[PDB]
Amino acid sequence: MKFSNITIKNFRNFEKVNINLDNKNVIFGMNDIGKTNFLYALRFLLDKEIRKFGFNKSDYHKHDTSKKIEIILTLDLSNYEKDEDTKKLISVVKGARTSANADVFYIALESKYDDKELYGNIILKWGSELDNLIDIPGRGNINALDNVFKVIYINPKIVIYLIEEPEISLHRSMQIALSKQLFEQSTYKYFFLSTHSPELLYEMDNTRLIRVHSTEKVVCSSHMYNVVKKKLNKALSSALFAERVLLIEGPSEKILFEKVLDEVEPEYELNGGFLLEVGGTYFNHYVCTLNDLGITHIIKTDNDLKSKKGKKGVYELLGLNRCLNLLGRENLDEITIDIPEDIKGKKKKERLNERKKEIFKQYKNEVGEFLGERIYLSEIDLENDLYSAIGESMKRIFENEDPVHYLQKSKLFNMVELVNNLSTKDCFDVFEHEKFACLKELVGS
Amino acid sequence: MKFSNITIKNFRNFEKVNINLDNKNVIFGMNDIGKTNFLYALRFLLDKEIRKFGFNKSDYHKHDTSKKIEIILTLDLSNYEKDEDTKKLISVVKGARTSANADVFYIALESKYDDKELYGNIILKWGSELDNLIDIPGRGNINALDNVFKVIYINPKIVIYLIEEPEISLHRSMQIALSKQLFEQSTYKYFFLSTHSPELLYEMDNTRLIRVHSTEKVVCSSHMYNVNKALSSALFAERVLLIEGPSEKILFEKVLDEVEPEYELNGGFLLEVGGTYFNHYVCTLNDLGITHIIKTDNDLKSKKGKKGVYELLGLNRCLNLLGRENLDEITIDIPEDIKGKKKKERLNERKKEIFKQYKNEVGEFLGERIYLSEIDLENDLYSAIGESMKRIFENEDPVHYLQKSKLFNMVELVNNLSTKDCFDVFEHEKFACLKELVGS
Amino acid sequence: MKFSNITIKNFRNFEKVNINLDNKNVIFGMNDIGKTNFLYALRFLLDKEIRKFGFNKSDYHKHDTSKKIEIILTLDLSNYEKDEDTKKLISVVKGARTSANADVFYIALESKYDDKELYGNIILKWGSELDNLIDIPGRGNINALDNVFKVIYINPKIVIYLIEEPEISLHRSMQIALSKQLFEQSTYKYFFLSTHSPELLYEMDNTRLIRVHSTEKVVCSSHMYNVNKALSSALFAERVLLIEGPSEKILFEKVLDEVEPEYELNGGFLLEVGGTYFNHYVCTLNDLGITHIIKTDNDLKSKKGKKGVYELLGLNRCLNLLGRENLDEITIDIPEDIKGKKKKERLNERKKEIFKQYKNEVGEFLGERIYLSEIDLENDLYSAIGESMKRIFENEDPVHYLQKSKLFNMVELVNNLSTKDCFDVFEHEKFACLKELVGS
Amino acid sequence: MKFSNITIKNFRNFEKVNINLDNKNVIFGMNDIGKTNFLYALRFLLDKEIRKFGFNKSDYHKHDTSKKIEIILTLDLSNYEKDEDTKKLISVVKGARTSANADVFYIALESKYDDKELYGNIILKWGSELDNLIDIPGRGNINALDNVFKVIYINPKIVIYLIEEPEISLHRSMQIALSKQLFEQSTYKYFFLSTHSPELLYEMDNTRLIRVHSTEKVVCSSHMYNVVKKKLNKALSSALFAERVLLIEGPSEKILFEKVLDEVEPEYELNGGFLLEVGGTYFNHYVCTLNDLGITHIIKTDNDLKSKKGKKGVYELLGLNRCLNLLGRENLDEITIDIPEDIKGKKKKERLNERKKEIFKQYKNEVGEFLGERIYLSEIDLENDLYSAIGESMKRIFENEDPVHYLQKSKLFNMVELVNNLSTKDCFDVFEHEKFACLKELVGS
DNA sequence: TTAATAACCCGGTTATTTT
DNA sequence: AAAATAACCGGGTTATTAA
DNA sequence: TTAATAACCCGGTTATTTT
DNA sequence: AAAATAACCGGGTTATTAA
Ligand SMILES: [Ca+2]
Ligand SMILES: [Ca+2]
Ligand SMILES: [Ca+2]
Ligand SMILES: [Ca+2]
């Protein structure tokens, strides 16, 4: 059967939380204290080597008050029919079942009065609902819960694994083999994985993802990850560890966006920001996964032009039409753009750059809910609104009259030329500019 | 209310022991392993910090089998009707006490299936007798035995103390202060003391003593002690020698150290008395169970107001340890001659005749553990090694040079003795006390 | 002033090595013993906290014999006349400096008589050449080598850092943050870095490279590196495969992992390029000393201004790596017909007709480390496993269905393939590039 | 060879000490800190495993100031002729031996600059006198001092032992066997023994004794101990660890003083007081060993009477001539004491107590000269001035008219009747009384 | 009846006869 | 010269005689 | 001389003919 | 219906032609 819920009330970080669970569920976050204490919350209920020591003074919320620790595990237990897992758990709970028709089962922990005798006194109780919970009979040192479940903890009989930080003293090619053996191998059914490395998250299927937030209220969001899956997961494996992911389309934009972010603050990686190269203008294949994850996508797009196939003389918009499909709206009409054949070269592109503003001026109301949503659109490319902000400083580097002419020929080659000569006082006006609000929305400040 | 018996059946040394206890138990012996495992048996019965870990494979007897560990305590409450502990312990049992007419109570430990799941498991059972033992109810991690008793273990509610080796890093005046503090204050009511030092047993009264043995069968003797600084070192020895003089111990230390220097670790001890009295020592040592060996010398005494009328002191002094009637007085007329030398020499020839026609009285003396000479110890030493006395004294009579000043010329012997010399002291039947101390 | 050589003679892995060094130098390899013992060989020469303990039995080579341990550091100070560190070195050498025309300096360690007194003993010795080596004067516990240098060892005056494994308990952004700081700051002038992570080698300039081998003779190559995210993972391998496609790496991650999953620990690596350019990679890896293997495919391009005039780009991209002269253009006339499929099918026969009578050019291509196919990789994949493509695709022509979706139908072959299938791929001459990844 | 003297200047407790030390040194005292620092001073001079770590900040005088730690050892080298250790030390110091005529040799230590480089820098120097000290040549890690001396430290070539606390985890007969292995066995020549137990001092000959005082200035008393020896050392083995020793004569006088001393304070066992019972009126055999030790003797005696063996009618004083023999003075003349023959029993003793009081009246200058020295004399018997200050409370427990007559018949048997029941208010008036001034002179408070 | 020395045992001394 | 012999001291134990 | 697309290579999408 | 075919986007490399 599957896990359903856990209700950890008065443990050392939690107040009243209901984390939804599943088999094969993976824990990540920015804090290590909450990811350690969520595994010790499972060790205090299902493992006797932690349950035999009792509760100390430290694991009562902060250190005291509201002295009733409850950990309640939910495991449903109404699959019946085929599997031997449900039979091997229903054959031992026969004094604590209300009927053979209930659909939720309860494994409840209780602990009271740490102020007297300096002991936690864990009482375990079985039942089918929160009314009429009946305590677990056990003769000596061993409960009737401990005969059934088995807990194996890893840090460098129903079996539940608990793995904390396995990539420390592990090779980076071995983590992909461990990512195969955790998920597509049928040996492991019930684990609770805590990790920090993206190579353990390459091959995932039927997996609930618990993200632990960096704030002190330690609230968790549980999302199922259901699904070329491998290239969709390998590029997004470093973006699963970030709440705020900027989606840029090319490698030369990341060269400027690394330096502009590193000249302002080193702590954008510490806050949870990430730069993701899409490699093209295909943004819909990532946000269908990030809608299910709930990761806040930030999208920067540039609009372009295209002649129609069977129609000559009218042009079909590319960037506004591909921004239309991310919201699922009705596509706009085609705009007749005329180019005379006697003028070619740069001046056809120079007239089409002014046509890119002339298709932007009367479609500003379309951008009025685009930029109100999480998609941002430029006017020609990134190389022109780079020139509209710091273009008085680009002339001394290139030693040329028109730096846009020098940059559109070799695109990625001359973005290296902007790296080796910049100042810390330079390029702060492009940081606070309104045309680069995606990098404001990444850092959250 | 006070403890009566323990029944530790299948523990890691014990096989079937019924060890009688009381309050203020004191454990000594030549093995530290059996005393540590006795205190571990009390920790697996009454302490939750050792009960929460369970039994290992090594906690059973040998490496495997005889897999039913019983540690059963006997409390013997009866009805004392004024003490607060008995009313409290009959208040917390409630349903597991069968009647108010019963007097003996049981706390029973069980352990089964060590070969399955690699766990010993401890099951605790209350009851008024060995039949109809009922399980102790407990809700979570806490038994109802844990709400009654408290165990404090010392190694450098109802309170039980367990003290193992407190004289390591402790001054001896602090050992005497701990000795009066253990048996004077009312806070130390229940303990199980394990020690090696004689200074912790100076003040001692109303004390059960457990002497564990050096053998592997780990059987022990329990003796109640109810009522001198050198007698406290004799409590650590099963077999002691009762001698009269400080000059005798100088010879019996040199003769024992030239052959067998490890007689002290086997369990032997030499106890100086300082006189010919032995009835004050064996009346204590019979209650201890300590096997006494007595070497004494017979003497004679004249009467009062009579000349030539004598009685015997040393034969009647051995007779007073039995309870038999005294001997008749022996009359002898002594010649005048040399008073300093030959008047003693007539009495030494008379005392050999007195020992000759009272040999059948000595036949039940030396058959039991009291041994007796015929003149003194010095002529019996002169009959053994008198061919070696004249080569180091340069005198015609070495008994004459040594009877006047005894201790000052006894160190003239022991500074020059070879390792080959005095092998005949062990092989004499006259000096069988020094072989009876060894036990061969 | 910057280092040029070391001579670690009889240390516990080394027999006779003369390892060239420079500043900011980086050690990597497949053994951690051979990278720990290099930093301990520097700590035994230049750090007093390891030199004060002496040599043990295990610090010599093998368990015993070859009993003269020499660690010799070569400075090559020359005459720089402006820097602070050369004058700070030469002001305190004093009497051991021979003349001002000398350019080579020595620090010679010695060790003798390990079998006597259970002590290794370390004797330090300055000098300008290997003849006339004079001892370092030191009055008490402190040498005159200790007044010049300083060693700080990192494990989670003239200052030498020694860093061993810093990415253990370090975040992946912090490795790229540490990667610039070793090579732009003036504080880290002299270090010896040991690592396993590719993120610490992103920013890298003016760096001697020490690669230790997996063999037991622990010989190493000293290569200067002077001047990309996937290329930093290719620095930790000797045999790398240079492929064009991301869909092609999906094809070689099934064939390798169904037979030999331990190819990554042996020292193999798959490097995507993203295009048919290879001259930007092997011009870098010639200075790296990394043995490249290149798999490429030949193509043809019509020339501008003419109809039916073609030239061969795929042979010229193999010609430019060796520096030979280009080939001449060919003429072929192709009819109209079906332009999507049947126009390509005549070009495949013309490409095979080109590949038939240019085989003597390919005879030195495949004799070098560049490998060429016949039309494309998906069509001599059809020569290997084309009898098994019709089970999964259920199509008449599987390469008609595969060329229109190069990546979209490759996961159908990856997701449905047995372990017995694609085992004959390794013994083709067409797919013989993947055997030199393993090295068999 | 023969050690002479050490000179430890600026080490952890010492300021300027010249502690005379021969072969077979035995160290006792009330502090373990100064004995451990004396053995670590010998380890910082002659052991390379302590010299390779150097001096810290903590092993200067307080923690700083007087920045020259100097340990100078004298061995004096001038036995010549026969022994091979003298030939070994004159064969290894072939350079720094100035002549073969001077009879003093030095092994020095120097260290400076604790505040610079945080390192002690021990420099060792050989010399024949304090002028012209010469550095020891050593090639690498090993000095030329380390080839000669060998140091073995025990805590549970010239071979020098250092033993600290060996009686922990040993039997008492093993301590007697270890004393026989140390002193009368010729395996150990040079040692520095530190101990707390009396059983390691039973067999003892040719031994320099260092007593370390309990005060902070750590001054040491250096006395050579030369000598029935075995029972004298068994009597004095618990008295060598005490600086104030009371010399009493009986066990009844011991158990009188034991309850009275324990009801005031338990501090006197911690301070260093000890009651040594003799077993008779022989005191000259104890003070001849305490004069060589320097232990101050406190002596309680009682004066008696004896008839002369050759003259009838004149009595010879025993207790006054016994006190005269301890000072070596001229013995006083005999006093004619008349006893009629018809008066027998205890009626003779009642006049004999008055005749002893009449002897004590006219020889008051002699008892004043005795009590001006370290010997104390009673009026007649301890029981009479027991009765003179307690004996109004001795009639309520004996239920007798005369408690002196009730106690002189059973001297020990009725002495334990005072032990089991006395209040703590009792025997405070006699504790500052002048007749029991030895009991106040034991503790010195 | 009830204490007070003759005698004995484990040790120590000190000045007076004694051959 | 040097080797006893009484008379005490620090502890116990009878037992006859004085009281 | 000197840039500007015609072709080629490693990936992706979306409307328009086409049989 | 479903199978190509242009025309762009994110990167590189020649090479003939307009300029
Ligand atoms: Ca763009
Ligand atoms: Ca005798
Ligand atoms: Ca290809
Ligand atoms: Ca007296």
PDB file of N, CA and C in Angstrom, chain B residues 184-227:
ATOM      1  N   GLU B 184      26.879   3.958  59.709  1.00  0.00           N
ATOM      2  CA  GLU B 184      26.376   4.862  60.735  1.00  0.00           C
ATOM      3  C   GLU B 184      25.121   5.609  60.306  1.00  0.00           C
ATOM      4  N   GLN B 185      25.113   6.169  59.097  1.00  0.00           N
ATOM      5  CA  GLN B 185      24.007   6.998  58.639  1.00  0.00           C
ATOM      6  C   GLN B 185      22.806   6.153  58.233  1.00  0.00           C
ATOM      7  N   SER B 186      21.623   6.751  58.346  1.00  0.00           N
ATOM      8  CA  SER B 186      20.376   6.096  57.975  1.00  0.00           C
ATOM      9  C   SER B 186      20.013   6.301  56.512  1.00  0.00           C
ATOM     10  N   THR B 187      20.803   7.080  55.767  1.00  0.00           N
ATOM     11  CA  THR B 187      20.562   7.235  54.337  1.00  0.00           C
ATOM     12  C   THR B 187      20.985   5.992  53.565  1.00  0.00           C
ATOM     13  N   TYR B 188      22.117   5.396  53.934  1.00  0.00           N
ATOM     14  CA  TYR B 188      22.558   4.134  53.344  1.00  0.00           C
ATOM     15  C   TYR B 188      21.855   3.002  54.081  1.00  0.00           C
ATOM     16  N   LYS B 189      20.641   2.683  53.640  1.00  0.00           N
ATOM     17  CA  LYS B 189      19.887   1.581  54.223  1.00  0.00           C
ATOM     18  C   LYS B 189      20.081   0.288  53.439  1.00  0.00           C
ATOM     19  N   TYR B 190      20.095   0.385  52.113  1.00  0.00           N
ATOM     20  CA  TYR B 190      20.202  -0.754  51.207  1.00  0.00           C
ATOM     21  C   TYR B 190      21.446  -0.551  50.355  1.00  0.00           C
ATOM     22  N   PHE B 191      22.479  -1.376  50.544  1.00  0.00           N
ATOM     23  CA  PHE B 191      23.569  -1.369  49.577  1.00  0.00           C
ATOM     24  C   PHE B 191      24.097  -2.771  49.316  1.00  0.00           C
ATOM     25  N   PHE B 192      24.938  -2.851  48.283  1.00  0.00           N
ATOM     26  CA  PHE B 192      25.680  -4.051  47.896  1.00  0.00           C
ATOM     27  C   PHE B 192      27.111  -3.594  47.625  1.00  0.00           C
ATOM     28  N   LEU B 193      27.981  -3.717  48.624  1.00  0.00           N
ATOM     29  CA  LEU B 193      29.331  -3.166  48.575  1.00  0.00           C
ATOM     30  C   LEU B 193      30.325  -4.188  48.041  1.00  0.00           C
ATOM     31  N   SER B 194      31.179  -3.756  47.115  1.00  0.00           N
ATOM     32  CA  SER B 194      32.294  -4.557  46.625  1.00  0.00           C
ATOM     33  C   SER B 194      33.587  -3.784  46.839  1.00  0.00           C
ATOM     34  N   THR B 195      34.578  -4.426  47.457  1.00  0.00           N
ATOM     35  CA  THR B 195      35.801  -3.732  47.846  1.00  0.00           C
ATOM     36  C   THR B 195      36.964  -4.712  47.927  1.00  0.00           C
ATOM     37  N   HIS B 196      38.169  -4.145  48.047  1.00  0.00           N
ATOM     38  CA  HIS B 196      39.397  -4.893  48.279  1.00  0.00           C
ATOM     39  C   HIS B 196      40.196  -4.405  49.478  1.00  0.00           C
ATOM     40  N   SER B 197      39.920  -3.205  49.990  1.00  0.00           N
ATOM     41  CA  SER B 197      40.767  -2.610  51.014  1.00  0.00           C
ATOM     42  C   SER B 197      40.268  -2.953  52.414  1.00  0.00           C
ATOM     43  N   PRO B 198      41.171  -3.221  53.366  1.00  0.00           N
ATOM     44  CA  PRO B 198      40.734  -3.522  54.738  1.00  0.00           C
ATOM     45  C   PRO B 198      40.287  -2.316  55.546  1.00  0.00           C
ATOM     46  N   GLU B 199      40.557  -1.093  55.087  1.00  0.00           N
ATOM     47  CA  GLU B 199      40.206   0.106  55.838  1.00  0.00           C
ATOM     48  C   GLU B 199      38.740   0.493  55.701  1.00  0.00           C
ATOM     49  N   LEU B 200      38.016  -0.088  54.748  1.00  0.00           N
ATOM     50  CA  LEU B 200      36.587   0.145  54.594  1.00  0.00           C
ATOM     51  C   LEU B 200      35.737  -0.780  55.453  1.00  0.00           C
ATOM     52  N   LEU B 201      36.355  -1.702  56.186  1.00  0.00           N
ATOM     53  CA  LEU B 201      35.641  -2.684  56.989  1.00  0.00           C
ATOM     54  C   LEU B 201      36.021  -2.588  58.463  1.00  0.00           C
ATOM     55  N   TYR B 202      36.382  -1.389  58.930  1.00  0.00           N
ATOM     56  CA  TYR B 202      36.750  -1.222  60.333  1.00  0.00           C
ATOM     57  C   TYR B 202      35.517  -1.151  61.225  1.00  0.00           C
ATOM     58  N   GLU B 203      34.628  -0.198  60.964  1.00  0.00           N
ATOM     59  CA  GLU B 203      33.343  -0.110  61.646  1.00  0.00           C
ATOM     60  C   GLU B 203      32.346  -0.911  60.821  1.00  0.00           C
ATOM     61  N   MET B 204      31.830  -2.000  61.388  1.00  0.00           N
ATOM     62  CA  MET B 204      30.942  -2.893  60.647  1.00  0.00           C
ATOM     63  C   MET B 204      30.024  -3.607  61.627  1.00  0.00           C
ATOM     64  N   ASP B 205      28.715  -3.497  61.405  1.00  0.00           N
ATOM     65  CA  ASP B 205      27.720  -4.080  62.295  1.00  0.00           C
ATOM     66  C   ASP B 205      26.444  -4.327  61.504  1.00  0.00           C
ATOM     67  N   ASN B 206      25.795  -5.472  61.795  1.00  0.00           N
ATOM     68  CA  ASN B 206      24.546  -5.975  61.190  1.00  0.00           C
ATOM     69  C   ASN B 206      24.671  -6.117  59.670  1.00  0.00           C
ATOM     70  N   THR B 207      25.571  -7.008  59.264  1.00  0.00           N
ATOM     71  CA  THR B 207      26.091  -7.021  57.904  1.00  0.00           C
ATOM     72  C   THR B 207      26.060  -8.438  57.361  1.00  0.00           C
ATOM     73  N   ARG B 208      25.378  -8.633  56.237  1.00  0.00           N
ATOM     74  CA  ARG B 208      25.506  -9.876  55.491  1.00  0.00           C
ATOM     75  C   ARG B 208      26.773  -9.811  54.648  1.00  0.00           C
ATOM     76  N   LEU B 209      27.593 -10.855  54.709  1.00  0.00           N
ATOM     77  CA  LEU B 209      28.840 -10.899  53.959  1.00  0.00           C
ATOM     78  C   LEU B 209      28.787 -12.028  52.947  1.00  0.00           C
ATOM     79  N   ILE B 210      29.041 -11.696  51.686  1.00  0.00           N
ATOM     80  CA  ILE B 210      29.106 -12.664  50.598  1.00  0.00           C
ATOM     81  C   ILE B 210      30.571 -12.799  50.210  1.00  0.00           C
ATOM     82  N   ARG B 211      31.123 -13.996  50.352  1.00  0.00           N
ATOM     83  CA  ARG B 211      32.484 -14.273  49.911  1.00  0.00           C
ATOM     84  C   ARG B 211      32.397 -15.131  48.660  1.00  0.00           C
ATOM     85  N   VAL B 212      32.663 -14.530  47.511  1.00  0.00           N
ATOM     86  CA  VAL B 212      32.741 -15.296  46.276  1.00  0.00           C
ATOM     87  C   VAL B 212      34.093 -15.997  46.207  1.00  0.00           C
ATOM     88  N   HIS B 213      34.121 -17.128  45.516  1.00  0.00           N
ATOM     89  CA  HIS B 213      35.291 -17.989  45.479  1.00  0.00           C
ATOM     90  C   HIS B 213      36.059 -17.800  44.177  1.00  0.00           C
ATOM     91  N   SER B 214      37.294 -18.300  44.171  1.00  0.00           N
ATOM     92  CA  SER B 214      38.179 -18.145  43.023  1.00  0.00           C
ATOM     93  C   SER B 214      37.895 -19.139  41.905  1.00  0.00           C
ATOM     94  N   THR B 215      37.097 -20.174  42.160  1.00  0.00           N
ATOM     95  CA  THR B 215      36.822 -21.193  41.161  1.00  0.00           C
ATOM     96  C   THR B 215      35.782 -20.703  40.154  1.00  0.00           C
ATOM     97  N   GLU B 216      35.625 -21.476  39.079  1.00  0.00           N
ATOM     98  CA  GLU B 216      34.728 -21.109  37.990  1.00  0.00           C
ATOM     99  C   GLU B 216      33.279 -21.501  38.242  1.00  0.00           C
ATOM    100  N   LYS B 217      32.988 -22.225  39.326  1.00  0.00           N
ATOM    101  CA  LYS B 217      31.610 -22.586  39.637  1.00  0.00           C
ATOM    102  C   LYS B 217      30.860 -21.479  40.368  1.00  0.00           C
ATOM    103  N   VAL B 218      31.575 -20.425  40.809  1.00  0.00           N
ATOM    104  CA  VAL B 218      31.163 -19.110  41.342  1.00  0.00           C
ATOM    105  C   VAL B 218      30.178 -19.218  42.527  1.00  0.00           C
ATOM    106  N   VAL B 219      30.314 -20.289  43.317  1.00  0.00           N
ATOM    107  CA  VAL B 219      29.494 -20.464  44.511  1.00  0.00           C
ATOM    108  C   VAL B 219      30.040 -19.585  45.629  1.00  0.00           C
ATOM    109  N   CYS B 220      29.144 -19.131  46.499  1.00  0.00           N
ATOM    110  CA  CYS B 220      29.502 -18.158  47.517  1.00  0.00           C
ATOM    111  C   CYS B 220      28.807 -18.492  48.827  1.00  0.00           C
ATOM    112  N   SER B 221      29.421 -18.058  49.922  1.00  0.00           N
ATOM    113  CA  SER B 221      28.931 -18.318  51.267  1.00  0.00           C
ATOM    114  C   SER B 221      28.396 -17.026  51.867  1.00  0.00           C
ATOM    115  N   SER B 222      27.211 -17.099  52.464  1.00  0.00           N
ATOM    116  CA  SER B 222      26.557 -15.947  53.066  1.00  0.00           C
ATOM    117  C   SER B 222      26.505 -16.133  54.575  1.00  0.00           C
ATOM    118  N   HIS B 223      27.135 -15.216  55.306  1.00  0.00           N
ATOM    119  CA  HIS B 223      27.202 -15.287  56.759  1.00  0.00           C
ATOM    120  C   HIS B 223      26.801 -13.950  57.357  1.00  0.00           C
ATOM    121  N   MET B 224      25.872 -13.987  58.308  1.00  0.00           N
ATOM    122  CA  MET B 224      25.464 -12.790  59.030  1.00  0.00           C
ATOM    123  C   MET B 224      26.520 -12.435  60.069  1.00  0.00           C
ATOM    124  N   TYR B 225      26.918 -11.165  60.104  1.00  0.00           N
ATOM    125  CA  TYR B 225      27.979 -10.705  60.992  1.00  0.00           C
ATOM    126  C   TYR B 225      27.388  -9.777  62.039  1.00  0.00           C
ATOM    127  N   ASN B 226      27.423 -10.209  63.296  1.00  0.00           N
ATOM    128  CA  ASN B 226      26.973  -9.406  64.418  1.00  0.00           C
ATOM    129  C   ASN B 226      28.061  -9.379  65.481  1.00  0.00           C
ATOM    130  N   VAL B 227      28.228  -8.221  66.110  1.00  0.00           N
ATOM    131  CA  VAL B 227      29.220  -8.075  67.166  1.00  0.00           C
ATOM    132  C   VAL B 227      28.543  -7.657  68.465  1.00  0.00           C
TER     133      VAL B 227
END
